Design a protein around this ligand. Structure first.
Ligand SMILES: Cc1ncc(COP(=O)(O)O)c(CNOCC(=O)O)c1O
Ligand SMILES: Cc1ncc(COP(=O)(O)O)c(CNOCC(=O)O)c1O
Lengths: 401, 401
């Protein structure tokens, strides 16, 4: 009897645990469709061109490694607020925002969850779509709030349960918190239609609910960043003061460097100035100040005309390629002799597909073909190259056939 | 009445807030002796030679930016455990350790604080020296444990209150937690003497207290890393299973990149394997995985014969130079006509000096000479160059004279 004799064996990460098991496999044909991670068309991890150049200039500068303020790099902070909101925005123009550099999306999400825990005096409840990205549950629980749900997907029709959503949303108690994904819903690939987004807005506004936007895939739903941010900005200008988490993990392909941000839209420049201070008191006893590299790459890109330009060409190339792969998937499916309807595959947007495979089929896939995906049937199409689309097709067919 | 109208203006960081105010000053002679941060002898932020080369090789490799496991870079993890413990160690030889890459010292400290909160079933109390590094209070409080104190420094004699320490320590309730600094006590510069460390050990062991070591300055107390780790290893081999936080923020001069680690010495390889899993469940809903750059630089240095070698030459050069500056300080003091006793200046070890200046003197210093330090009278000698030792001396004298 030791200090830790009572500490039991906790299970591997639902998602993250998929790269683990993937690593270990000896099949030369294994494919990791586990986490939303882009592979170029050789299915080689891809580092954007503009990032490679952003690193070169920093390099060249012979920059110091001195501690960054508790809120992060001013320049990255400010440039993110902008990417989120648009430069014309009254919110942005007026300075009624506070943006803190955070530990990528996951970290922004959590500083955010702990901020609310601490200053959101109106409710302990955070309402999450059904289904949501797995980590939302624990981020929120470890922070100290309660979890609730609003109906989102409908597996019968492979899309948005707009009447059911509208119903749960309409009954959320005034002033609770609700998590909405900005675009490329994870895990479903289904997003409200402009029109729907206008309606959600109304009911959100009407119930005076605190809107919390998870924006990890901006430029991944349509190949266009301003378009992707539509719903977000439509809210704020409808008079909704949101909170949001942003990640550069996928759109900049900055994954392991970890760069993200957390923002609060307040009412004044003075309120923003007051929240900033508190965000900083909260963040100090956490990790004191954040990782400088990712913030530095991104800020040079966002703030360098040519670097941003290149950035959109290449954020465009990624969205497209995911599209050719969806296309081609469906195609081989039919070509392999698939009897099923694979329309959702090319219907869905973002990095994933929500295929509908049942667990024994997901399991056989892993075991017989070395194709690694989460057991909810979600596969990352992000991860498919011209070279293995055939292989996935076949596999999919065998196990389904 | 907004969401955040009730959120008040919290004060600037006690330490961190000193770089802020420093930044803003227009005096060409301002000096920032606020945070423990090394400046070369031009008093220019210094990036070690071996780091500059570590970056070059990574660069050259054209490494990917893919997500790292929840526990960090295996290689950095393992190499830190070693730097902490020594390669001969039974602890290390046997694998009864779990090391998680964390968000520098501050972050390791907190993962650690939350781990305890969650699995340390024996007490909610963490006993901190008097005085301790400021952030210890809030790290620990935000995590959820209670704070307590053991007498440490004695301002009458400018040293260790060994009878008072021994007394408080001897009365700590069995199984509580106690934070001990490994070397270069922050803020005092006073460390137990080998002999004292042997005695602390006994009373710790005897009371069956959970020893928590904060090791942020290894190679800063003596210019020698193995020596610096003496007390730490002496504990474990006396049968004490500790927990420790390590930082590479000062010894690698990796400040803003943020690389650190948190370790638990358990009883077996299987227990270690069980704690690892739980550490990872805890860390996932936090920041999902940590900043890859610092971990990558450090691991190439620690694990490259030539890179480590260079590393010690240069960790030796930093300790030395801090010594010449202390020396010279005292010297000018006398030369400026100082009536006081400045023996503690050269008596103390590490990055700081605990000068004894009262707040009105600290204040005048800031205001008349542009010398920025914390109000506890602590100055970072780390920060003095051959060029400004004269200036500090004078200043010190004026305000003291
Ligand atoms: C919707 C959503 N929000 C937020 C995030 C967080 O991403 P990051 O922390 O990498 O910025 C992700 C990241 N996902 O990919 C990795 C995983 O499941 O852990 C995500 O899908
Ligand atoms: C004793 C001690 N432990 C732990 C730490 C944490 O250092 P880091 O998080 O930079 O690794 C420090 C860092 N101090 O310098 C910066 C500050 O006061 O915030 C320290 O002195």
């Amino acid at each position: 009897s030791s200090w830790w004799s009572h500490v039991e064996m906790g299970p591997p990460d639902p998602i993250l645990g998929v790269t683990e098991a993937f690593k270990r496999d000896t099949n030369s044909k294994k494919m990791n469709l586990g986490v939303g991670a882009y592979r170029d068309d050789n299915g080689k991890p891809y580092v954007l061109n503009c990032v490679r150049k952003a690193e070169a200039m920093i390099a060249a500068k012979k920059m110091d490694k001195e501690y960054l303020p508790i809120a992060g790099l001013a320049d990255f902070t400010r440039a993110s607020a902008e990417l989120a909101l648009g430069e014309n925005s009254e919110a942005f123009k007026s300075g009624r925002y506070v943006t803190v550099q955070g530990i990528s999306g996951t970290g922004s999400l959590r500083v955010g969850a702990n901020f609310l825990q601490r200053f959101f005096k109106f409710s302990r409840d955070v309402y999450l779509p059904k289904p949501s990205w797995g980590n939302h549950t624990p981020i929120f629980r470890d922070a100290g709030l309660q979890l609730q749900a609003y109906r989102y997907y409908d597996p019968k029709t492979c899309s948005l349960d707009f009447t059911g959503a509208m119903e749960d949303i309409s009954k959320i108690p005034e002033k609770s918190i609700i998590l909405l994904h900005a675009c490329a819903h994870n895990p479903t690939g289904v997003d409200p239609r402009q029109e729907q987004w206008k309606e959600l807005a109304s009911v959100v506004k009407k119930r005076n609910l605190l809107a919390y936007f998870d924006m990890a895939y901006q430029g991944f739903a349509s190949g266009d960043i301003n378009r992707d941010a539509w719903a977000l900005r439509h809210f704020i200008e409808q008079g909704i003061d949101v909170v949001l988490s942003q990640s550069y993990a996928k759109n900049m392909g900055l994954y392991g460097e970890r760069a993200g941000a957390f923002t609060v839209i307040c009412r004044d420049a003075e309120e923003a100035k007051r929240v900033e201070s508190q965000l900083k008191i909260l963040i100090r006893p956490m990790y004191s100040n954040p990782p400088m590299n990712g913030a530095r790459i991104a800020s040079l890109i966002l703030n360098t005309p040519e670097l941003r330009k290149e950035w959109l060409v290449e954020v465009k190339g990624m969205a497209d390629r995911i599209i050719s792969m969806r296309t081609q998937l469906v195609s081989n499916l039919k070509k392999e002799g698939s009897s099923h309807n694979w329309q959702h595959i090319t219907d869905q947007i973002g990095m994933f597909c929500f295929t509908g495979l049942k667990p024994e089929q997901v399991e056989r896939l892993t075991k017989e073909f070395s194709i690694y995906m989460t057991k909810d049937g979600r596969i990352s199409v992000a991860g498919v190259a011209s070279s293995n689309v055939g292989y996935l097709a076949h596999a999919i067919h065998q196990v389904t056939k």
